Amino acid sequence: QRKPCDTMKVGGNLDSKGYGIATPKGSSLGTPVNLAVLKLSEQGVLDKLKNKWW
Amino acid sequence: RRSKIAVFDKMWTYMRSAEPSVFVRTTAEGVARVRKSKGKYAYLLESTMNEYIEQRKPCDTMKVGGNLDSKGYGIATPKGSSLGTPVNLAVLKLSEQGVLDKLKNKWW
Amino acid sequence: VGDGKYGARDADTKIWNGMVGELVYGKADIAIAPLTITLVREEVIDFSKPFMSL
Amino acid sequence: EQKTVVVTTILESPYVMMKKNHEMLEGNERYEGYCVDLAAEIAKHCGFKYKLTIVGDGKYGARDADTKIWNGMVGELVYGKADIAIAPLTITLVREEVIDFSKPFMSL
């Protein structure tokens, strides 16, 4: 989706991996962040953000 | 029911107002309704089930399209049990060494 | 186990019924089944990183 | 009382990009993109003020087997200096041993 827009993608995915938020071990931030990162996934906000940039 | 991004809502408005009822309350009824309708009818279900149903007899249906979202299965442990933390490493160490791909290929 | 479902909350009694209830009431040590990860479940049981995507 | 929390991230585009007004603007307004929008949503949930800083050495990093040093974002995070890494940091086995990842927010 960037100029000159002359590539194309083909086919499936050969593997699977995921990104993630990260925090230091024993931080108090660790449990609420994981709840937010689930809650945002179900309200569709993440896909709205993806479309907003891709 | 909570869709966004101004494409799904057309489908939702359609299914809210089509006649006769487009929904089915058991999955085998949906499969039968696809199989009998000479390709005039389509159905939405979990991709992991779809990719299996393709491989059974009569072998008369196929997957088409990509995806609308993403979800995953997971191992479950009771809260605060000491057993949970090594399993979380085990699942990772398996995935990086192809076992969870070969076990999928074996059965699908 | 005789659930047939994958566990859900009864909104009336607040009792957990089915698969997840057997872990909350401690009848077994670990469950391995294709239960889907959603926000309602993390609040009472813990899940690994996801072993599949769909 | 609460104190503002540092947040470390790497440009890498389009996850983070420079604003076309950085000649004049000051503070967080220097930065925009998908990462910044996600940051504001997490901040609205958890209720913390946050100050962005670009990572010091431009790399994700991994443990050097010789010196046992951690470089990169993981370096700034493990040694108690950054406190959160909102970044496209790929989950892999060697990292789970020293930091905790949320459930994954995107698949690739």
Structural class of chain A: mainly alpha
Integer-rounded radius of gyration of chain A: 16 Å
Order of helices and strands of chain A: EHH
Strand content bin of chain A = 5-15%
Extracellular side (chain B): 1-108
Subcellular location (chain B): Cell membrane; Postsynaptic cell membrane; Postsynaptic density membrane
Organism (chain B): Rattus norvegicus
Family (chain B): Belongs to the glutamate-gated ion channel (TC 1.A.10.1) family. GRIA2 subfamily.
In short:
This is part of a larger assembly, with 4 copies of chain A. Chain A is mainly α.
SSE map:
This is part of a larger assembly, with four copies of chain A.
Chain A: E1 22-24, H1 30-42, H2 45-51
Q: What does this 3D model show about the protein?
A:
- The structure is cut from a larger assembly and holds four copies of chain A.
- Chain A has 54 residues and is mostly helical.
- Helices cover 37% and strands 6% of the residues of chain A.
- The first copy, chain A, contains two helices and one strand.
- In chain A, 13% of the residues are buried.
- Chains A and D meet through β1, α1 and α2 of A and α1 and β5 of D.
- It is classed as transport protein.
- The entry lists the keywords ligand-gated ion channel, ionotropic glutamate receptor, ampa receptor, ion channel, transport protein.
